[PDB]
């Protein structure tokens, strides 16, 4: 499998470093942000399906799914949205403008929670995670895995190790030891009900209970 390496733009590498290092208190906002991206990605596939309902056939169910993996200290956020082609992942760039604007607003004293308003709320995941894999499948393209440690370099490899998505995106968040509360059914239920009431799509939570 060929791991293509790429370097992050200097503004993107500095944004990633700011968030991963910050002390922000309301770190739970990351979930609103990722859910909001997943909901938007679903809106995008649903729009195409208004024209062409064959676009939905790669994964007919439209959903956001939250999958804690206590064994691996991993929280996965999966959507069956539009997904991202390999070219998308290697060049993901409205980010450039929103990264600069958001950085200016932070100087003026904006709170970290305003990140979504500048369109770069994906990077809020580094509040609770030190490393991240992003697995994506766009309809007319193959399934790839993007990877970043918040440094200045990310990889994009063909996906030969993860479950097939059918269509969409799954973020594998490698949580920090301080933020392992977000693997908890009850803690995750709190954050979702608080900040994502108005989501057109089912937010499914996967829970592994032992049969007694
Ligand atoms: C989701 O995985 C990745 C990987 C690198 C960069 C981005 C990203 C970055 C932004 F700054 C702003 C927006 C994005 C993503 C956010 C996103 N999330 C999800 N769940 N699905 C899609 C299609 C996108 C999308 O279209 N663009 N997302």
* DSSP conformation letters of 122-157: GGGGGGTEEEEEEEEE-TTS-EEEEEE-SSSEEEEE
DSSP one-letter code for 116: G
Q: Cα(70) to centroid of ligand 1, in Å?
A: 25
Give backbone dihedrals phi and psi of 59, rounded to 5 degrees, phi first.
Answer: -170, 85
Looking at the domain assignment, is residue 83 inside a domain? yes
User: 102 lies in which domain range?
Assistant: 4-205
The resolution, in angstroms to one decimal, equals 2.5
Per the structure, the count of domains in the chain is: 1
Does 194 map to a domain?
yes
Residue 120 lies in a domain: yes
- Radius of gyration in angstroms for the set of CA atoms belonging to the chain, rounded to a whole number: 17
CA 82 vs CA 29, 135, 162, 207: distances in Å: 23, 13, 18, 25
This entry's atomic model was obtained through: X-ray
Residue 113 lies in a domain: yes
Cα–Cα dist 48/90, whole Å = 23
Ligand 1: distance of its center to the CA of 209 in Å? 31
Of residues 176, 148, 128, 134, the one with CA closest to residue 31:
128
**In-domain check, residue 119:** yes
Residue 93: inside a domain: yes
Q: Is residue 44 part of a domain?
A: yes
Residue 211 within any structural domain of the chain? no
122 has binding-site annotation: yes
Substitution site in 11, 64, 169, 172 for ligand 1 pocket (most atoms within 8 Å of beta carbon): 169
Q: Consult the annotation and say whether 96 binds a ligand.
A: yes
97 CA distance to ligand 1 middle (Å): 15
| Structural contact between residues 37 and 30, judged by C-beta atoms closer than 8 angstroms | no
Q: List helix spans (H) across the chain.
A: 10-21, 29-51, 86-90, 95-107, 185-195
**Which CATH number belongs to the domain containing residue 66 in this structure?**
3.30.565.10
Alpha-carbon distance of 86 to 43, in angstroms, equals 20
95 in contact with ligand 1, CB cutoff 6 A: yes
């Amino acid at each position: 499998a060929k791991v293509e390496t790429h370097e992050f733009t200097a503004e993107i590498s500095q944004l990633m470093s700011l968030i991963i290092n910050t002390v922000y208190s309301n770190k739970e906002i990351f979930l609103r942000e990722l859910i909001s991206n997943a909901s938007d990605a679903l809106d995008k596939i649903r729009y195409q399906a208004l024209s062409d309902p064959s676009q939905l056939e790669s994964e007919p169910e439209l959903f956001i799914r939250i999958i804690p993996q206590k064994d691996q200290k991993v929280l996965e956020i999966r959507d069956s949205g539009i997904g991202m082609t390999k070219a998308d992942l290697v060049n993901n760039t409205i980010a450039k403008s929103g990264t600069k604007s958001f950085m200016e607003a932070l100087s003026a004293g904006a709170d970290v929670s305003m990140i979504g308003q500048f369109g770069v709320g994906f990077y809020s995941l580094f509040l609770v995670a030190d490393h991240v894999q992003v697995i994506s499948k766009h309809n007319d393209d193959e399934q790839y895995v993007w990877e970043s440690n918040a440094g200045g370099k990310f990889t994009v490899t063909l996906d030969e190790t993860n479950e097939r998505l059918g269509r969409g995106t799954m973020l594998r968040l490698f949580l920090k030891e301080d933020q392992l509360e977000y693997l908890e059914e009850k803690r995750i239920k709190e954050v979702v009900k608080k900040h994502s009431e108005f989501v057109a799509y089912p937010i499914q939570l996967v829970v592994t209970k032992e049969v007694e």
